[PDB]
Amino acid sequence: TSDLIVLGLPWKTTEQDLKEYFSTFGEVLMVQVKKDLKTGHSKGFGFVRFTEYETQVKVMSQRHMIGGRWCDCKLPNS
DNA sequence: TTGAGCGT
């Protein structure tokens, strides 16, 4: 139901790469990685929106290895 | 090049 955030994301990692990973847990609507609009390099974190609530907690209920680094899905601070 | 945090 809510937009999740992911911390610890490697720098080279991209949006497509996440879809590959989170699409293993369930219905992914969108993903957006945060970058500098001058370089396009990733801040090391992004967001992710699922369709089902089951798949969201499952993801928020654990840590995730991504690009060779562990990342934690948390509830944000809109 | 970098590694806690929180979305043009």
Residue numbers in the entry: 103 to 180
Provide text from the study.
One example is TDP-43, which binds RNA and DNA and functions in mRNA splicing, translation regulation and transport. However, when misfolded, TDP-43 aggregates and forms the major component in the ubiquitylated inclusions in the neuronal cells of patients with amyotrophic lateral sclerosis (ALS) and frontotemporal lobar degeneration (FTLD). TDP-43 consists of an N-terminal domain (NTD) and two tandem RNA recognition motifs, RRM1 and RRM2, followed by a C-terminal glycine-rich region (G). It forms homodimers and the two RNA-recognition motifs are involved in nucleic acid binding.
The overall structure of RRM1-D169G mutant is similar to that of wild-type RRM1, nevertheless, a small local difference was observed in the β turn (Turn6) containing the D169G mutation. However in the D169G mutant, the β turn (Turn6) connecting the β4 and β5 strands, which contains the D169G mutation, shifted slightly due to the loss of the hydrogen bond between D169 and T115. The largest shift in the β turn is located around the mutation site G169 (chain A) whose Cα atom was shifted by 0.8 Å as compared to that of D169 of wild-type RRM1 (chain A). The β turn in all the four RRM1-D169G structures in the asymmetric unit has a similar shift of 1.0 Å (G169, Cα atom) on average as compared to wild-type RRM1 (D169, Cα atom), suggesting that this shift is inherent for the D169G mutant. We found that the D169G mutation consistently enhanced thermal stability in all TDP-43 constructs examined, with a larger melting point increase of 7–8 °C for the smaller RRM1 and N-RRM1 proteins and a smaller increase of 2–3 °C for the larger N-RRM12 and N-RRM12-G proteins. Here, we provide biochemical, structural, simulation, and cellular data to show that compared to wild-type TDP-43, the ALS-linked D169G mutation in TDP-43 generates a more stable protein that is cleaved by caspase 3 more efficiently, producing increased levels of TDP-35, but not TDP-25. Since the stabilization effect resulting from the D169G mutation is more pronounced in smaller protein constructs such as RRM1 (+7.6 °C) than larger constructs such as N-RRM12 (+2.0 °C), the smaller TDP-35 could be stabilized more than the full-length TDP-43 by the D169G mutation and hence, the TDP-43 D169G mutant is more susceptible to caspase 3 digestion.
